[PDB]
Amino acid sequence: REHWATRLGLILAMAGNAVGLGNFLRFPVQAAENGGGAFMIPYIIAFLLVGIPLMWIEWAMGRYGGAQGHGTTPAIFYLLWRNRFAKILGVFGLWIPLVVAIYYVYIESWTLGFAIKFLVGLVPEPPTDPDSILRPFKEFLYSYIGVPKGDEPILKPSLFAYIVFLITMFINVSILIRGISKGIERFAKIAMPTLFILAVFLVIRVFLLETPNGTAADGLNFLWTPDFEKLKDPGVWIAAVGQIFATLSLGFGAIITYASYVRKDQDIVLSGLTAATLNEKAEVILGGSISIPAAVAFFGVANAVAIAKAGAFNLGFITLPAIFSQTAGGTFLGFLWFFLLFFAGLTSSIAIMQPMIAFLEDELKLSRKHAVLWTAAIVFFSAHLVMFLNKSLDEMDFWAGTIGVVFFGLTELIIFFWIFGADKAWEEINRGGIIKVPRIYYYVMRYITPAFLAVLLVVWAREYIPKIMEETHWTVWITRFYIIGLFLFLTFLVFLAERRRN
Numbered sequence: 001r002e003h004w005a006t007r008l009g010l011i012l013a014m015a016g017n018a019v020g021l022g023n024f025l026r027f028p029v030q031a032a033e034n035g036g037g038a039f040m041i042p043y044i045i046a047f048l049l050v051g052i053p054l055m056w057i058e059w060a061m062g063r064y065g066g067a068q069g070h071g072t073t074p075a076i077f078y079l080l081w082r083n084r085f086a087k088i089l090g091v092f093g094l095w096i097p098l099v100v101a102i103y104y105v106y107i108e109s110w111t112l113g114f115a116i117k118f119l120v121g122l123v124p125e126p127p128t129d130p131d132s133i134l135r136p137f138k139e140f141l142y143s144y145i146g147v148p149k150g151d152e153p154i155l156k157p158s159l160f161a162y163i164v165f166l167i168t169m170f171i172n173v174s175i176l177i178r179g180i181s182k183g184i185e186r187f188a189k190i191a192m193p194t195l196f197i198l199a200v201f202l203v204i205r206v207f208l209l210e211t212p213n214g215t216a217a218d219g220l221n222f223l224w225t226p227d228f229e230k231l232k233d234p235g236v237w238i239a240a241v242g243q244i245f246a247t248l249s250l251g252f253g254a255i256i257t258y259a260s261y262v263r264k265d266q267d268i269v270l271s272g273l274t275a276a277t278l279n280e281k282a283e284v285i286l287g288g289s290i291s292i293p294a295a296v297a298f299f300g301v302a303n304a305v306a307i308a309k310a311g312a313f314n315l316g317f318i319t320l321p322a323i324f325s326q327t328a329g330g331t332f333l334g335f336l337w338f339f340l341l342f343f344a345g346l347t348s349s350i351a352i353m354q355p356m357i358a359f360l361e362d363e364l365k366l367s368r369k370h371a372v373l374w375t376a377a378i379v380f381f382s383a384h385l386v387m388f389l390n391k392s393l394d395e396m397d398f399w400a401g402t403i404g405v406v407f408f409g410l411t412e413l414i415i416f417f418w419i420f421g422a423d424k425a426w427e428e429i430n431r432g433g434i435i436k437v438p439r440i441y442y443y444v445m446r447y448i449t450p451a452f453l454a455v456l457l458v459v460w461a462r463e464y465i466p467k468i469m470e471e472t473h474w475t476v477w478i479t480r481f482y483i484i485g486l487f488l489f490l491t492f493l494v495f496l497a498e499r500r501r502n
């Protein structure tokens, strides 16, 4: 099996995995929509009672299965629990990362294209009216991704957007094709430091933004000012948990696959903890100090929140660059923003393709080159669905990026810490650890986490099962059909691997 060269390389690769578009796009929005400071408390609790324990669990499973030449859940679930249904449940560990890769890589390509255009200086040129400043950029984005006037099902992506997508795929391939240590690690060791430096620079530059309408400091206060009136809103807790799952790459099967390349004896406790901590620093400190503080700086708190509620991409791709345009060298600033976003995305996309690649290598005994090329072909092909169909990306993000990750988290936690055995699991997690997990977390993993997740899934199910059947648009049915087909396909592959074993 292939392994990580250095412990630092490992840490930075995992950090790259976690630290992505979720930190600089999703988080600011989620925090603003949920009352800023009010959102933090749950966010923290969820981080302590869900993020950390699941992180350690996925590291443990990853290393465990990896020691036996398996980096994916279809095989690992079987090693932990002898049963066909364990493999079937294991299929989600490829389905989820595949589905998410599909649209994630596309958004990443967006950030790339924007970075390019902003570097070259091909951007809309605003003239004191907010709408006359945001409109040009709304038209810019809509032209780029091909959004229809009304609510029409067909998207018409510009040629440049398509080409940029192809390029992005090429880059992902060029990195993934060099393996774990020579590919992912060597790139992480650069992309990560670069990312942090850019993030810091932007945080400062933004902190220097002050107008008659507000200041960035106002935004910081808003985000870090507690509010206990929202603690009775389940939606805030659900949002927090969702954010934790998303940002920590939990339930995606990526952490496990990366962990499978960690030597059986090496520590996963301190390493994992460090990666998670890095991600949180990048999120609450860097990610939360750019977009929101700037929006608040220009339009004030209320309008900032309104824009946040307007959409996820509305803030990162429209509002922020429009704000930048009103400053000296704001175009270059935009370029830095989108470049940061690009590295952040890439270092995560490679992580979500590595599970599929790893399955092809381990279970179908394919070479690295072939595995990477085929994974790239499948993702690229399927990506047309997201590119040309309106509301497809949202549906995928929902079924895989929202429900699927939670369901899968509960599944892996139950299999590892209940069926496989809580004591054996604990010993497996702590073994080789440079530091040891506080005993309390044992009780957190065995009772608290699974209970909370179960409740969450119950609520979600109750709220969504009726809405599901009554859906008007056909694009969502086409998408559902398709991803279901992908599930059947992956199942078939798992079957072939199983038969090859015999």
Ligand code: MET
Pocket (backbone or CB within 6 Å): 017, 018, 019, 020, 021, 022, 023, 246, 247, 248, 249, 252, 254, 348, 349, 351, 352
């Ligand atoms: C590595 S795909 C999962 C999402 C990622 N953790 C992010 O923050 O964007």
Ligand code: NA
Pocket (backbone or CB within 6 Å): 015, 016, 017, 018, 019, 020, 021, 343, 344, 345, 346, 347, 348, 349
């Ligand atoms: Na990343």
Ligand code: NA
Pocket (backbone or CB within 6 Å): 017, 018, 019, 020, 022, 023, 246, 247, 248, 249, 279, 283
């Ligand atoms: Na993250």
